[PDB]
Write a protein that binds this DNA or RNA. Structure first.
Ligand code: 8DG
Ligand code: CA
Ligand code: CA
Ligand code: CA
Length: 326
DNA sequence: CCGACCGCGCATCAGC
DNA sequence: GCTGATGCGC
DNA sequence: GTCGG
């Protein structure tokens, strides 16, 4: 965190553009600059020094000069004073409340945690659960708890069908000492790109995890993606563990490497890598990497036997998960 | 100067 | 009910 | 907000 002051500033600007302005390209511009600066191995001395980095342009260089001189950014000091922006920014921290709903809630005079808690009937299901665990979802998960959580998920999945493979991805797979939440990649041989020889594959796993009281709430659920809430068991007289967010993604078994690349991230890493894919005439998603024809139409799925094959196609040296934390 | 900015699953809703 | 757009999220 | 063409 050589440049923590700067990257914090940029992230707050990023958050303003997403939540308030609803300017997603600006949000992404700010996040990209923050990311490139975060890995830059020097304490930055000027906006000019920063503008050398890709993604840092004229306007952010100016802000970095202002920040270095004064320790502050006038633009942000103002945003912080503005009640409508403060309220919107607050409300979007509830899972399920995005920029649009936040602004609509403010319009109706719902703008504090108390307001939310007295108007539960104005929330959809996701939002109500996001509100219920507002505090818990703020907390990070120690790797040691992630490890206990992995063990429960892996062993319960095995009890359902020993042919399931469950892989914990996200920042955990990147080696992080703490994680925002748990991400499980699920495969089963019955579900391939060619056929689905077995229904309820995700359901069965979700039910078993609910049965043992690991999964406690559901935010959304379909055939291939679960988004919900889980909690470690606690011992006699112990305070309960906080509730945690969990995502489970069922991916065609033959498309595992594209899936685990996607689910391992980071999100900014994924965005960067997919952009680069396009520059190189490929398109990457969680299933496949395909060539872009002479017109911009995706061709057939290229063969993939490893994460490295994907990097190879786009002429990137292989990067271990622990170095994908952009 | 300006087009393009990654890709997609689930929930909600409007129109038909 | 279906379809397509939008919101929110990974 | 930034960048390549
Ligand atoms: N292609 C793409 N992938 C994304 C996006 N957002 C996003 O989270 N992903 C991927 C990469 C992430 O590592 C993975 C899991 O999301 P996550 O919110 O749990 O993030 P994480 O594990 O890296 O980090 P964290 O929980 O410690 O905060 O989903 C996106 O916008 N585009
Ligand atoms: Ca995570
Ligand atoms: Ca997650
Ligand atoms: Ca995230």
């Amino acid at each position: 965190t050589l440049n923590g002051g700067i990257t914090d500033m940029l992230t707050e600007l990023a958050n303003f553009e997403k939540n308030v302005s609803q300017a997603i390209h600006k949000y992404n511009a700010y996040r990209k600059a923050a990311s490139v600066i975060a890995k830059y191995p020097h304490k930055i001395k000027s906006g000019a020094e920063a503008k050398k980095l890709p993604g840092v342009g004229t306007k952010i260089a100016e802000k970095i000069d202002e920040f270095l001189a004064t320790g502050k950014l006038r633009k942000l000091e103002k945003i912080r004073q503005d009640d409508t922006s403060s309220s919107i920014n607050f409300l979007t921290r509830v899972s399920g409340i995005g920029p649009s709903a936040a602004r609509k809630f403010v319009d109706e005079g719902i703008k504090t945690l108390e307001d939310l808690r007295k108007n539960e009937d104005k929330l959809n299901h996701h939002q109500r659960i996001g509100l219920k665990y507002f505090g818990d979802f703020e907390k990070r998960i120690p790797r040691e708890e992630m490890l206990q959580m992995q063990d429960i998920v892996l062993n319960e999945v095995k009890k359902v069908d020993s042919e399931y493979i469950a892989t914990v991805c996200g920042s955990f797979r990147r080696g992080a000492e703490s994680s925002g939440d748990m991400d499980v990649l699920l495969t089963h041989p019955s579900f391939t790109s060619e056929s689905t020889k077995q229904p309820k594959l995700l359901h069965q796993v979700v039910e078993q995890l609910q049965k043992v009281h690991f999964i406690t709430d559901t935010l959304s659920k379909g055939e291939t993606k679960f988004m919900g809430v889980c909690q470690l068991p606690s011992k006699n007289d112990e305070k309960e563990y906080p509730h945690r967010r969990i995502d489970i993604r069922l991916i065609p078994k033959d498309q595992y490497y594209c899936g685990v690349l996607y689910f391992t991230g980071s999100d900014i890493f994924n965005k960067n890598m997919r952009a680069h894919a396009l520059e190189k005439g490929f398109t990457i998603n969680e299933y496949t990497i395909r060539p872009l024809g002479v017109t911009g139409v995706a061709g057939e799925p290229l063969p993939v036997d490893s994460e490295k094959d994907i990097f190879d196609y786009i002429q990137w040296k292989y990067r271990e998960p622990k170095d994908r934390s952009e």
